[PDB]
């Protein structure tokens, strides 16, 4: 089988399939499609059949072979800037939901705290990438960046841990029947954030970082 | 159609239907009044397949139908089959969880907090069963079950708290699924935990869905 990261970046809409299977293609892009079943000891034939047909048409944009400088500029505008705009909004929405629906049992109590931890750590994380690691790659020094890259990958792991908690506090971002408009819309935004953040980390761990280290 | 019957009645009439609902995480014990239809819709599950699985299991009658048994025999059965077993099994699980949380402290999948939650369950369950054995079960055996709305509602409320802890224990243990690196002690403990959950849900089911309502109805 091929690596998770290789398939997610080469087959359109394979990203969401892996996310709903609890398959870590971002920080666990190391993982091959085979061992992914080991976690759940579940069918691989279905996943290969789905993937084979999902690949009817080429990918909208193959970043695997794109210049590293363009990958960087793409990450800044498509993921970093979006994260900075979304998380302050989600924090406020979670505040409103945890107060307005405090008396209900299905309310995701603690979501604001966990979203806030993610915002603080992700902001610092992205500031470090944009001010230290990305410039160093643009100057052609990626081959000497094991240290900084390993620090970012460690922080990627931390963020993934927080994502798992957030997914638990919200029953895998599934609104209960009591969900109002604010509540449902917040969960939609939360799913959007998780989708973007896994594709974001995936692109970094599975393309930008290894290619930089290899001297591209 | 089975989908229109209450969970509790299905569990009490179809052999091993209890295990099918535990596989689907359907609460037939404290939520046995809930119909299979509403329970399956709540979890976005194909109810027609569940009905086929039930019809298969229902090819065979229940080995022992407690729904029509004398209340005194239900009580004596509960005490020996569930209460006495819970008392022997929780102390063993507490010590095993202690050994596992120490020995495998350095591993990621270790069920941190399992000993605390097992202990809370044991404490609340112990006092719960004593209050049943000393207060509620005697009054039902005396023919006063129709005057036991109060005590039964207190027992049912405590059944709900117990279910809350069971849900905590299940999350701490990845739904009682050992990781690949699980040793023998770790695997055997999770087996015991599943046995406890199985028994306690059949235990609570028998009380909420048979003993309590029939006692209140004057049987
Ligand atoms: Mn980044
Ligand atoms: Mn990053
Ligand atoms: Mn009891
Ligand atoms: Mn009881
Ligand atoms: O990032
Ligand atoms: O019980």
Numbering used by the authors:
A (entry chain B): 5 to 220
B (entry chain A): 2 to 220
Authors' account:
We also provide a new structure of the Escherichia coli YtfE in which the iron binuclear center is replaced by manganese ions and discuss its impact on the overall structure. For this purpose, wild type YtfE was incubated with Mn2+ ions during the crystallization process and X-ray diffraction data were collected. Analysis of the anomalous difference maps obtained from data collected above the Mn and Fe K-absorption edges shows that the metal site contains in both positions a mixture of iron and manganese ions: in position 2, which is closer to E159, manganese represented ca. 45% of the metal occupation, while position 1 retained almost all the iron, as only ca. 10% of manganese was present. Therefore, iron in position 2 is more easily displaced by manganese than that in position 1. This observation is consistent with the Mössbauer data showing that in YtfE one of the iron atoms is more labile. Hence it was of relevance to determine the affinity of the wild type YtfE to manganese and compare it with that of iron. This study was done by analyzing the quenching of the intrinsic fluorescence intensity of YtfE upon the addition of Mn2+ or Fe2+, and determination of the binding constants for each metal. Moreover, the binding affinity constants of the wild type and mutated protein are significantly higher for iron than for manganese (ka = 6.5 ± 0.3 × 10−6 M (Fe2+) and 0.5 ± 0.2 × 10−6 M (Mn2+)).
Repair of Iron Center proteins (RIC) form a family of di-iron proteins that are widely spread in the microbial world. RICs contain a binuclear nonheme iron site in a four-helix bundle fold, two basic features of hemerythrin-like proteins. YtfE has an L-shaped two-domain architecture: it exhibits an N-terminal ScdA_N domain connected through a highly flexible penta-peptide to the C-terminal four-helix bundle hemerythrin-like domain containing the di-iron site. Altogether the data so far gathered for YtfE such as the induction by NO stress, the interaction of YtfE with Dps and proteins of the iron-sulfur biogenesis system, the iron donor properties of YtfE, and the ability of YtfE to promote the formation of an iron-sulfur center in IscU and ferredoxin, all indicate that YtfE is a bacterial iron donor.
